[PDB]
Design a protein around this ligand. Structure first.
Ligand code: HEM
Length: 153
């Protein structure tokens, strides 16, 4: 679905993310909450964080961003061959957290924004197109798994 060149652009910028997983995850979650505040409702503890500085100071949020980006990176590195990595994520996000696909679109937008903000020289139009294809594939495949579990979000 992605070409080998597209996967290489995805993994090239992902290596830059991995130089500071925690900082990238903080910026991505903070961007998600500021652009789409309704998403913050899904987090029992984090939803009580009232300012950007509190969000940046939160060890809980920082640890969570690392968990999120580690899971996403493990999926991306499979270059589409991600059933085993995607299934447990679909299970929890469909049946426990109840995260609609539109919220995965919102976080994909935040990922793109932060990648471009931090790595513009390694995240031009072709690299952005490749990352958008990879995240579109992630969202398509997770939506199919959602439906297999009975969730139409
Ligand atoms: C790139 C997309 C995402 C990835 C890779 C991801 C990954 C994860 C991982 C690995 C966990 C911990 C294990 C688990 O419960 O499955 C998790 C927990 C969670 N995620 Fe996601 N996540 C995604 C997007 C979202 C979005 C968009 C929301 C809400 C808008 C969300 C809210 C949840 C919540 C509420 C928890 C439980 C947090 C807790 O109580 O400790 N996630 N996520």
């Amino acid at each position: 679905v992605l070409s080998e060149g597209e996967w290489q652009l995805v993994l090239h910028v992902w290596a830059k993310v991995e130089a500071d997983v925690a900082g990238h995850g903080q910026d991505i979650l903070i961007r998600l909450f500021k652009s789409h505040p309704e998403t913050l409702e899904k987090y029992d503890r984090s939803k009580h964080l009232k300012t950007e500085a509190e969000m940046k100071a939160s060890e809980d949020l920082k640890k969570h961003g690392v968990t999120v980006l580690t899971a996403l990176g493990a999926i991306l590195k499979k270059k589409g061959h991600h059933e085993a990595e995607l299934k447990p994520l679909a299970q929890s996000h469909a049946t426990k957290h109840k995260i609609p696909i539109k919220y995965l679109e919102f976080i994909s937008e935040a990922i793109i924004h932060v990648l471009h903000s931090r790595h513009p020289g390694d995240f031009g139009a072709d690299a952005q197109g490749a990352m958008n294809k990879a995240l579109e594939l992630f969202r398509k495949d997770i939506a199919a798994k959602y439906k297999e579990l009975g969730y139409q979000g």
